[PDB]
Protein backbone atom coordinates (compact mmCIF):
# COMPACT_ATOMS: atom_id res chain seq x y z
CA UNK A 1 0.00 0.00 0.00
CA UNK A 2 1.22 3.51 -0.90
CA UNK A 3 -0.26 4.70 2.46
CA UNK A 4 1.79 2.16 4.41
CA UNK A 5 4.89 3.43 2.63
CA UNK A 6 4.05 7.03 3.54
CA UNK A 7 3.69 6.13 7.23
CA UNK A 8 6.88 4.04 7.15
CA UNK A 9 8.76 7.01 5.69
CA UNK A 10 7.41 9.34 8.38
CA UNK A 11 8.47 6.84 11.01
CA UNK A 12 11.99 6.92 9.54
CA UNK A 13 12.13 10.74 9.75
CA UNK A 14 11.04 10.82 13.39
CA UNK A 15 13.41 8.04 14.41
CA UNK A 16 16.24 10.00 12.78
CA UNK A 17 15.07 13.20 14.48
CA UNK A 18 15.03 11.45 17.88
CA UNK A 19 18.39 9.76 17.42
CA UNK A 20 19.89 13.18 16.58
CA UNK A 21 18.12 14.94 19.47
CA UNK A 22 19.45 12.29 21.91
CA UNK A 23 22.88 12.01 20.41
CA UNK A 24 23.80 15.43 19.01
CA UNK A 25 21.42 17.39 21.27
CA UNK A 26 18.15 19.10 20.44
CA UNK A 27 19.81 22.50 20.35
CA UNK A 28 22.74 21.35 18.16
CA UNK A 29 20.59 19.50 15.61
CA UNK A 30 19.01 21.41 12.74
CA UNK A 31 16.29 20.47 10.28
CA UNK A 32 18.96 19.95 7.57
CA UNK A 33 20.90 17.46 9.72
CA UNK A 34 17.62 15.59 9.99
CA UNK A 35 16.86 15.76 6.24
CA UNK A 36 20.41 14.63 5.39
CA UNK A 37 20.16 11.44 7.47
CA UNK A 38 16.54 10.91 6.42
CA UNK A 39 17.95 10.64 2.90
CA UNK A 40 15.37 9.61 0.31
CA UNK A 41 12.65 9.07 2.89
CA UNK A 42 12.45 12.85 3.03
CA UNK A 43 12.06 14.71 -0.25
CA UNK A 44 9.68 17.37 0.90
CA UNK A 45 7.46 16.18 3.72
CA UNK A 46 4.24 18.18 3.72
CA UNK A 47 2.56 16.60 6.73
CA UNK A 48 3.92 19.08 9.30
CA UNK A 49 7.48 17.88 8.88
CA UNK A 50 8.49 21.45 7.99
CA UNK A 51 10.74 22.00 11.04
CA UNK A 52 12.77 20.57 13.88
CA UNK A 53 10.14 21.82 16.35
CA UNK A 54 7.28 20.11 14.54
CA UNK A 55 9.18 16.84 14.31
CA UNK A 56 9.72 16.98 18.03
CA UNK A 57 6.02 17.57 18.68
CA UNK A 58 5.07 14.73 16.32
CA UNK A 59 7.24 12.46 18.43
CA UNK A 60 5.67 13.85 21.60
CA UNK A 61 2.22 13.09 20.16
CA UNK A 62 3.13 9.41 19.95
CA UNK A 63 4.66 9.28 23.42
CA UNK A 64 1.69 11.02 24.95
CA UNK A 65 -0.66 8.59 23.21
CA UNK A 66 1.23 5.54 24.54
CA UNK A 67 1.46 6.86 28.12
CA UNK A 68 -2.30 7.37 28.03
CA UNK A 69 -3.08 3.79 26.95
CA UNK A 70 -0.59 2.20 29.30
CA UNK A 71 -2.19 4.09 32.20
CA UNK A 72 -5.69 3.25 31.06
CA UNK A 73 -4.93 -0.48 31.14
CA UNK A 74 -3.53 -0.35 34.67
CA UNK A 75 -6.75 1.22 35.91
CA UNK A 76 -8.87 -0.97 33.62
CA UNK A 77 -7.69 -4.09 35.45
CA UNK A 78 -9.73 -2.81 38.40
CA UNK A 79 -12.70 -4.76 39.74
CA UNK A 80 -15.18 -2.30 41.34
CA UNK A 81 -12.12 -0.68 42.87
CA UNK A 82 -12.41 1.74 45.75
CA UNK A 83 -11.33 5.31 45.06
CA UNK A 84 -8.19 4.44 47.04
CA UNK A 85 -7.48 1.52 44.74
CA UNK A 86 -7.84 3.20 41.37
CA UNK A 87 -5.98 6.32 42.63
CA UNK A 88 -3.17 4.07 43.76
CA UNK A 89 -3.24 2.13 40.49
CA UNK A 90 -3.12 5.36 38.44
CA UNK A 91 -0.56 6.89 40.84
CA UNK A 92 1.89 4.02 40.31
CA UNK A 93 1.70 4.03 36.50
CA UNK A 94 1.86 7.84 36.29
CA UNK A 95 4.76 8.24 38.70
CA UNK A 96 6.74 5.42 37.00
CA UNK A 97 6.41 7.17 33.66
CA UNK A 98 7.94 10.40 35.02
CA UNK A 99 10.81 8.48 36.60
CA UNK A 100 12.34 7.34 33.28
CA UNK A 101 15.33 9.22 31.76
CA UNK A 102 13.18 9.63 28.68
CA UNK A 103 10.76 11.96 30.49
CA UNK A 104 13.62 14.13 31.80
CA UNK A 105 15.30 14.29 28.40
CA UNK A 106 12.11 15.49 26.70
CA UNK A 107 11.56 17.73 29.70
CA UNK A 108 14.85 19.53 29.01
CA UNK A 109 13.94 20.08 25.35
CA UNK A 110 10.63 21.70 26.28
CA UNK A 111 12.21 23.97 28.96
CA UNK A 112 14.76 25.13 26.38
CA UNK A 113 11.94 26.41 24.12
CA UNK A 114 10.94 28.91 26.77
CA UNK A 115 11.93 31.85 24.48
CA UNK A 116 10.91 30.34 21.11
CA UNK A 117 8.91 33.08 19.35
CA UNK A 118 7.05 30.38 17.40
CA UNK A 119 5.01 28.89 20.28
CA UNK A 120 4.58 25.42 18.77
CA UNK A 121 4.52 24.38 22.39
CA UNK A 122 1.42 26.43 23.27
CA UNK A 123 -0.37 25.13 20.15
CA UNK A 124 0.57 21.54 21.00
CA UNK A 125 -0.79 21.81 24.54
CA UNK A 126 -3.91 23.77 23.50
CA UNK A 127 -4.59 21.34 20.71
CA UNK A 128 -4.47 18.05 22.62
CA UNK A 129 -5.62 18.43 26.19
CA UNK A 130 -7.94 15.49 25.51
CA UNK A 131 -4.89 13.27 25.11
CA UNK A 132 -3.52 13.94 28.60
CA UNK A 133 -3.63 11.20 31.19
CA UNK A 134 -5.40 13.35 33.84
CA UNK A 135 -8.56 12.87 31.75
CA UNK A 136 -8.59 9.22 32.87
CA UNK A 137 -8.70 10.35 36.52
CA UNK A 138 -11.32 12.99 35.68
CA UNK A 139 -13.59 10.22 34.37
CA UNK A 140 -13.74 8.27 37.60
CA UNK A 141 -14.35 11.39 39.66
CA UNK A 142 -17.56 12.07 37.75
CA UNK A 143 -18.68 8.49 38.33
CA UNK A 144 -18.51 9.08 42.06
CA UNK A 145 -22.00 9.77 43.46
CA UNK A 146 -20.37 12.68 45.28
CA UNK A 147 -21.28 16.20 44.22
CA UNK A 148 -17.97 17.71 45.35
CA UNK A 149 -16.07 15.11 43.33
CA UNK A 150 -18.07 15.63 40.15
CA UNK A 151 -18.22 19.44 40.10
CA UNK A 152 -14.48 19.69 40.72
CA UNK A 153 -13.41 16.55 38.86
CA UNK A 154 -11.00 18.23 36.45
CA UNK A 155 -9.42 20.32 39.19
CA UNK A 156 -9.04 17.25 41.43
CA UNK A 157 -7.45 15.20 38.68
CA UNK A 158 -4.92 17.93 38.05
CA UNK A 159 -4.25 18.36 41.77
CA UNK A 160 -3.52 14.68 42.33
CA UNK A 161 -1.12 14.20 39.42
CA UNK A 162 0.59 17.46 40.46
CA UNK A 163 1.10 16.07 44.04
CA UNK A 164 2.66 12.92 42.50
CA UNK A 165 4.79 14.73 39.97
CA UNK A 166 6.13 17.99 41.36
CA UNK A 167 8.45 19.47 42.31
CA UNK A 168 10.46 16.32 41.43
CA UNK A 169 10.15 16.36 37.65
CA UNK A 170 11.03 20.01 37.73
CA UNK A 171 14.23 19.31 39.69
CA UNK A 172 15.04 16.28 37.55
CA UNK A 173 14.81 18.50 34.47
CA UNK A 174 16.47 21.68 35.78
CA UNK A 175 19.43 20.30 37.73
CA UNK A 176 19.33 16.58 37.12
CA UNK A 177 18.08 15.63 40.56
CA UNK A 178 18.15 11.81 40.80
CA UNK A 179 15.07 9.83 39.75
CA UNK A 180 12.99 7.86 42.23
CA UNK A 181 13.49 4.11 42.31
CA UNK A 182 10.42 1.85 42.68
CA UNK A 183 10.30 1.71 46.51
CA UNK A 184 10.39 5.49 46.69
CA UNK A 185 7.71 5.71 43.98
CA UNK A 186 5.32 3.44 45.87
CA UNK A 187 6.19 5.28 49.08
CA UNK A 188 5.35 8.65 47.57
CA UNK A 189 2.12 7.44 45.96
CA UNK A 190 0.87 6.05 49.30
CA UNK A 191 1.92 9.25 51.09
CA UNK A 192 0.00 11.37 48.53
CA UNK A 193 -3.13 9.17 48.29
CA UNK A 194 -3.51 9.33 52.05
CA UNK A 195 -3.35 13.17 52.27
CA UNK A 196 -5.55 13.53 49.19
CA UNK A 197 -8.27 11.18 50.48
CA UNK A 198 -7.92 11.84 54.20
CA UNK A 199 -6.22 15.14 54.94
CA UNK A 200 -3.42 15.52 57.47
CA UNK A 201 -5.84 15.52 60.42
CA UNK A 202 -5.46 11.83 61.27
CA UNK B 203 32.34 54.46 54.73
CA UNK B 204 34.36 52.61 52.05
CA UNK B 205 32.15 49.53 52.76
CA UNK B 206 28.97 51.48 52.06
CA UNK B 207 30.47 52.59 48.76
CA UNK B 208 31.32 48.99 47.84
CA UNK B 209 27.74 47.86 48.50
CA UNK B 210 26.33 50.86 46.62
CA UNK B 211 28.49 49.97 43.63
CA UNK B 212 27.33 46.34 43.71
CA UNK B 213 23.75 47.55 43.86
CA UNK B 214 24.40 49.62 40.72
CA UNK B 215 25.77 46.58 38.85
CA UNK B 216 22.78 44.40 39.71
CA UNK B 217 20.26 47.10 38.85
CA UNK B 218 21.97 47.48 35.46
CA UNK B 219 22.02 43.71 35.01
CA UNK B 220 18.28 43.50 35.78
CA UNK B 221 17.34 46.44 33.58
CA UNK B 222 19.21 44.75 30.69
CA UNK B 223 17.71 41.32 31.41
CA UNK B 224 14.19 42.83 31.39
CA UNK B 225 14.74 45.16 28.50
CA UNK B 226 17.22 43.49 26.14
CA UNK B 227 16.49 39.93 27.32
CA UNK B 228 18.57 37.60 29.46
CA UNK B 229 19.74 35.66 26.43
CA UNK B 230 20.64 38.78 24.39
CA UNK B 231 22.55 40.52 27.20
CA UNK B 232 26.20 39.67 27.78
CA UNK B 233 28.53 40.41 30.68
CA UNK B 234 30.20 43.16 28.60
CA UNK B 235 26.88 44.95 27.97
CA UNK B 236 26.51 44.94 31.74
CA UNK B 237 30.06 46.20 32.41
CA UNK B 238 29.65 48.95 29.78
CA UNK B 239 26.53 50.41 31.43
CA UNK B 240 27.95 49.80 34.91
CA UNK B 241 30.69 52.21 33.84
CA UNK B 242 33.07 53.14 36.66
CA UNK B 243 31.08 51.25 39.28
CA UNK B 244 32.56 48.13 37.73
CA UNK B 245 36.33 48.00 37.28
CA UNK B 246 36.87 44.40 38.16
CA UNK B 247 34.29 43.12 40.62
CA UNK B 248 35.75 40.22 42.56
CA UNK B 249 32.75 39.38 44.73
CA UNK B 250 31.22 36.82 42.33
CA UNK B 251 30.41 39.44 39.72
CA UNK B 252 32.48 37.45 37.21
CA UNK B 253 29.57 36.56 34.90
CA UNK B 254 26.05 37.22 33.70
CA UNK B 255 24.89 34.02 35.42
CA UNK B 256 26.34 35.00 38.77
CA UNK B 257 24.82 38.47 38.59
CA UNK B 258 21.47 36.88 37.97
CA UNK B 259 21.85 34.59 40.98
CA UNK B 260 22.96 37.50 43.16
CA UNK B 261 19.72 39.23 42.23
CA UNK B 262 17.78 36.03 42.93
CA UNK B 263 19.42 35.85 46.37
CA UNK B 264 17.91 39.23 47.26
CA UNK B 265 14.47 38.37 45.88
CA UNK B 266 14.40 35.07 47.70
CA UNK B 267 15.40 36.80 50.94
CA UNK B 268 12.58 39.38 50.63
CA UNK B 269 9.91 36.80 49.74
CA UNK B 270 10.93 34.87 52.86
CA UNK B 271 10.56 37.86 55.21
CA UNK B 272 7.32 39.07 53.68
CA UNK B 273 5.84 35.60 54.18
CA UNK B 274 7.19 35.32 57.70
CA UNK B 275 5.42 38.54 58.73
CA UNK B 276 2.06 37.39 57.36
CA UNK B 277 2.24 34.26 59.47
CA UNK B 278 3.78 36.15 62.41
CA UNK B 279 0.63 38.25 62.75
CA UNK B 280 -1.07 35.06 63.92
CA UNK B 281 -2.49 34.74 67.43
CA UNK B 282 -2.41 31.05 68.47
CA UNK B 283 -3.70 30.34 64.98
CA UNK B 284 -5.19 27.01 64.08
CA UNK B 285 -3.31 24.96 61.50
CA UNK B 286 -6.04 26.04 59.07
CA UNK B 287 -5.34 29.68 59.82
CA UNK B 288 -1.59 29.75 59.43
CA UNK B 289 -1.77 27.50 56.33
CA UNK B 290 -4.26 29.91 54.84
CA UNK B 291 -2.13 32.91 55.86
CA UNK B 292 1.00 31.36 54.31
CA UNK B 293 -0.99 30.11 51.28
CA UNK B 294 -2.19 33.63 50.43
CA UNK B 295 1.23 35.28 50.67
CA UNK B 296 2.97 32.45 48.79
CA UNK B 297 0.43 32.24 45.98
CA UNK B 298 0.39 36.06 45.54
CA UNK B 299 4.15 36.07 45.10
CA UNK B 300 3.98 33.55 42.23
CA UNK B 301 1.22 35.52 40.53
CA UNK B 302 3.40 38.57 39.75
CA UNK B 303 4.95 39.02 36.27
CA UNK B 304 8.28 39.22 38.05
CA UNK B 305 8.11 35.56 39.10
CA UNK B 306 7.29 34.44 35.54
CA UNK B 307 10.05 36.57 34.03
CA UNK B 308 12.68 35.08 36.36
CA UNK B 309 11.06 31.71 35.77
CA UNK B 310 11.77 31.98 32.03
CA UNK B 311 15.43 32.84 32.66
CA UNK B 312 15.92 29.78 34.84
CA UNK B 313 14.17 27.41 32.34
CA UNK B 314 16.45 28.74 29.59
CA UNK B 315 19.54 27.60 31.56
CA UNK B 316 18.41 24.00 31.26
CA UNK B 317 21.47 23.16 29.07
CA UNK B 318 24.04 25.46 30.74
CA UNK B 319 27.13 23.28 31.30
CA UNK B 320 28.11 25.53 34.22
CA UNK B 321 25.32 24.53 36.67
CA UNK B 322 25.31 27.77 38.66
CA UNK B 323 21.67 26.91 39.12
CA UNK B 324 22.35 23.61 40.92
CA UNK B 325 24.93 25.32 43.17
CA UNK B 326 22.50 28.14 43.96
CA UNK B 327 19.73 25.74 44.98
CA UNK B 328 22.07 23.39 46.88
CA UNK B 329 23.68 26.29 48.64
CA UNK B 330 20.59 28.06 50.00
CA UNK B 331 17.80 25.64 50.78
CA UNK B 332 17.64 27.31 54.20
CA UNK B 333 16.48 30.50 52.52
CA UNK B 334 13.39 28.94 50.93
CA UNK B 335 9.97 29.86 52.23
CA UNK B 336 8.85 26.23 52.76
CA UNK B 337 11.12 26.25 55.83
CA UNK B 338 8.62 28.60 57.50
CA UNK B 339 5.86 25.99 57.01
CA UNK B 340 8.21 23.22 58.16
CA UNK B 341 8.67 25.05 61.47
CA UNK B 342 5.02 25.05 62.43
CA UNK B 343 4.60 21.39 61.50
CA UNK B 344 7.20 20.40 64.09
CA UNK B 345 5.42 22.49 66.71
CA UNK B 346 2.32 20.39 66.22
CA UNK B 347 2.04 17.75 68.97
CA UNK B 348 1.31 15.31 66.16
CA UNK B 349 3.88 12.65 65.38
CA UNK B 350 2.87 12.32 61.73
CA UNK B 351 3.22 16.08 61.27
CA UNK B 352 6.64 16.30 62.87
CA UNK B 353 8.30 13.26 61.25
CA UNK B 354 7.13 14.33 57.80
CA UNK B 355 7.27 18.09 58.33
CA UNK B 356 9.63 18.87 55.46
CA UNK B 357 7.77 16.63 53.05
CA UNK B 358 4.43 18.18 54.07
CA UNK B 359 5.71 21.71 53.65
CA UNK B 360 6.92 20.90 50.16
CA UNK B 361 3.65 19.14 49.30
CA UNK B 362 1.49 22.08 50.32
CA UNK B 363 3.41 24.78 48.47
CA UNK B 364 3.50 22.45 45.43
CA UNK B 365 -0.35 22.12 45.55
CA UNK B 366 -0.59 25.95 45.63
CA UNK B 367 1.99 26.57 42.95
CA UNK B 368 1.85 23.92 40.25
CA UNK B 369 1.17 23.29 37.49
CA UNK B 370 0.25 27.00 37.16
CA UNK B 371 3.69 28.57 37.50
CA UNK B 372 4.96 26.03 35.03
CA UNK B 373 2.31 27.01 32.48
CA UNK B 374 2.80 30.71 33.18
CA UNK B 375 6.50 30.27 32.43
CA UNK B 376 6.33 27.86 29.47
CA UNK B 377 3.46 29.28 27.44
CA UNK B 378 2.47 32.44 29.24
CA UNK B 379 -0.75 31.10 30.72
CA UNK B 380 -2.56 34.03 32.41
CA UNK B 381 -1.85 34.79 36.06
CA UNK B 382 -4.46 34.33 38.77
CA UNK B 383 -6.19 37.46 40.04
CA UNK B 384 -6.86 37.79 43.79
CA UNK B 385 -10.29 36.10 43.89
CA UNK B 386 -8.90 33.08 42.07
CA UNK B 387 -5.88 33.04 44.41
CA UNK B 388 -8.04 32.97 47.54
CA UNK B 389 -10.30 30.41 45.86
CA UNK B 390 -7.40 28.10 45.10
CA UNK B 391 -5.84 28.45 48.55
CA UNK B 392 -9.14 27.50 50.23
CA UNK B 393 -9.61 24.59 47.80
CA UNK B 394 -6.08 23.30 48.59
CA UNK B 395 -6.17 23.85 52.38
CA UNK B 396 -9.37 21.84 52.57
CA UNK B 397 -8.00 18.78 50.67
CA UNK B 398 -4.69 19.00 52.52
CA UNK B 399 -6.29 19.13 55.99
CA UNK B 400 -9.39 17.05 55.31
CA UNK B 401 -9.01 14.82 52.27
CA UNK B 402 -11.64 14.53 49.56
CA UNK B 403 -13.79 12.18 51.65
CA UNK B 404 -16.16 14.85 52.98
Ligand SMILES: C[C@H](CCC(=O)O)[C@H]1CC[C@H]2[C@@H]3[C@H](O)C[C@@H]4C[C@H](O)CC[C@]4(C)[C@H]3C[C@H](O)[C@]12C
Nearest residue numbers: 102103104106107125132134158161162369372
Ligand atom coordinates in the same frame (compact mmCIF):
# COMPACT_ATOMS: atom_id res chain seq x y z
C1 LIG C 1 4.44 13.86 28.79
C2 LIG C 1 4.73 15.29 28.33
C3 LIG C 1 6.14 15.39 27.74
C4 LIG C 1 7.03 14.17 28.07
C5 LIG C 1 7.78 14.35 29.37
O1 LIG C 1 8.57 15.32 29.47
O2 LIG C 1 7.98 13.29 30.01
C6 LIG C 1 4.51 16.31 29.45
C7 LIG C 1 5.52 17.47 29.38
C8 LIG C 1 4.77 18.76 29.75
C9 LIG C 1 3.47 18.22 30.33
C10 LIG C 1 2.27 19.16 30.51
C11 LIG C 1 2.47 20.40 31.38
O3 LIG C 1 3.84 20.82 31.40
C12 LIG C 1 1.97 20.16 32.81
C13 LIG C 1 0.46 19.91 32.85
C14 LIG C 1 0.10 19.24 34.18
C15 LIG C 1 -1.35 18.81 34.35
O4 LIG C 1 -1.41 17.45 34.81
C16 LIG C 1 -2.06 18.87 33.02
C17 LIG C 1 -1.16 18.19 32.00
C18 LIG C 1 -0.01 19.11 31.63
C19 LIG C 1 -0.51 20.07 30.55
C20 LIG C 1 1.17 18.29 31.12
C21 LIG C 1 0.74 17.20 30.14
C22 LIG C 1 1.89 16.27 29.73
O5 LIG C 1 2.10 15.19 30.68
C23 LIG C 1 3.18 17.06 29.38
C24 LIG C 1 3.05 17.62 27.96
Ligand SMILES: C[C@H](CCC(=O)O)[C@H]1CC[C@H]2[C@@H]3[C@H](O)C[C@@H]4C[C@H](O)CC[C@]4(C)[C@H]3C[C@H](O)[C@]12C
Nearest residue numbers: 167170304305306308309327334336360363364
Ligand atom coordinates in the same frame (compact mmCIF):
# COMPACT_ATOMS: atom_id res chain seq x y z
C1 LIG D 1 11.63 32.23 43.88
C2 LIG D 1 12.58 31.43 42.98
C3 LIG D 1 12.87 32.21 41.69
C4 LIG D 1 11.91 33.38 41.45
C5 LIG D 1 10.67 32.96 40.68
O1 LIG D 1 10.84 32.48 39.53
O2 LIG D 1 9.63 33.58 40.97
C6 LIG D 1 12.06 30.02 42.68
C7 LIG D 1 12.40 29.56 41.26
C8 LIG D 1 12.76 28.06 41.33
C9 LIG D 1 12.27 27.68 42.72
C10 LIG D 1 12.73 26.37 43.36
C11 LIG D 1 12.43 25.08 42.59
O3 LIG D 1 12.32 25.31 41.18
C12 LIG D 1 11.16 24.41 43.11
C13 LIG D 1 11.31 23.95 44.57
C14 LIG D 1 9.92 23.72 45.17
C15 LIG D 1 9.87 23.38 46.66
O4 LIG D 1 8.91 24.22 47.32
C16 LIG D 1 11.22 23.65 47.28
C17 LIG D 1 11.67 25.03 46.82
C18 LIG D 1 12.15 24.94 45.38
C19 LIG D 1 13.61 24.48 45.40
C20 LIG D 1 12.03 26.32 44.72
C21 LIG D 1 12.54 27.44 45.62
C22 LIG D 1 12.29 28.84 45.03
O5 LIG D 1 10.96 29.34 45.32
C23 LIG D 1 12.68 28.91 43.53
C24 LIG D 1 14.20 29.07 43.42
